[PDB]
Curated annotation (Swiss-Prot):
Gene: RIPK1
Superkingdom, taxonomy of origin: Eukaryota
Protein name from the UniProt record: Receptor-interacting serine/threonine-protein kinase 1
Biological role: Serine-threonine kinase which is a key regulator of TNF-mediated apoptosis, necroptosis and inflammatory pathways. Exhibits kinase activity-dependent functions that regulate cell death and kinase-independent scaffold functions regulating inflammatory signaling and cell survival. Has kinase-independent scaffold functions: upon binding of TNF to TNFR1, RIPK1 is recruited to the TNF-R1 signaling complex (TNF-RSC also known as complex I) where it acts as a scaffold protein promoting cell survival, in part, by activating the canonical NF-kappa-B pathway.
Organism name: Homo sapiens
PTM comment: (Microbial infection) Proteolytically cleaved by S.flexneri OspD3 within the RIP homotypic interaction motif (RHIM), leading to its degradation and inhibition of necroptosis.
Recorded domain comment: The RIP homotypic interaction motif (RHIM) mediates interaction with the RHIM motif of RIPK1. Both motifs form a hetero-amyloid serpentine fold, stabilized by hydrophobic packing and featuring an unusual Cys-Ser ladder of alternating Ser (from RIPK1) and Cys (from RIPK3).
Subunit: Homodimer. Interacts (via RIP homotypic interaction motif) with RIPK3 (via RIP homotypic interaction motif); this interaction induces RIPK1 phosphorylation and formation of a RIPK1-RIPK3 necroptosis-inducing complex. Upon TNF-induced necrosis, the RIPK1-RIPK3 dimer further interacts with PGAM5 and MLKL; the formation of this complex leads to PGAM5 phosphorylation and increase in PGAM5 phosphatase activity. Interacts (via the death domain) with TNFRSF6 (via the death domain) and TRADD (via the death domain). Is recruited by TRADD to TNFRSF1A in a TNF-dependent process.
From-to range in the entire protein, with total length: 539 to 542 of 671
Protein family: Belongs to the protein kinase superfamily. TKL Ser/Thr protein kinase family.
Disease: Immunodeficiency 57 with autoinflammation: An autosomal recessive primary immunodeficiency characterized by lymphopenia and recurrent viral, bacterial, and fungal infections. Patients exhibit early-onset inflammatory bowel disease involving the upper and lower gastrointestinal tract, and develop progressive polyarthritis.
Subcellular locations according to the entry: Cytoplasm; Cell membrane
Length: 4
């Protein structure tokens, strides 16, 4: 999970 990568958010940004």
């Amino acid at each position: 999970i990568q958010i940004g």
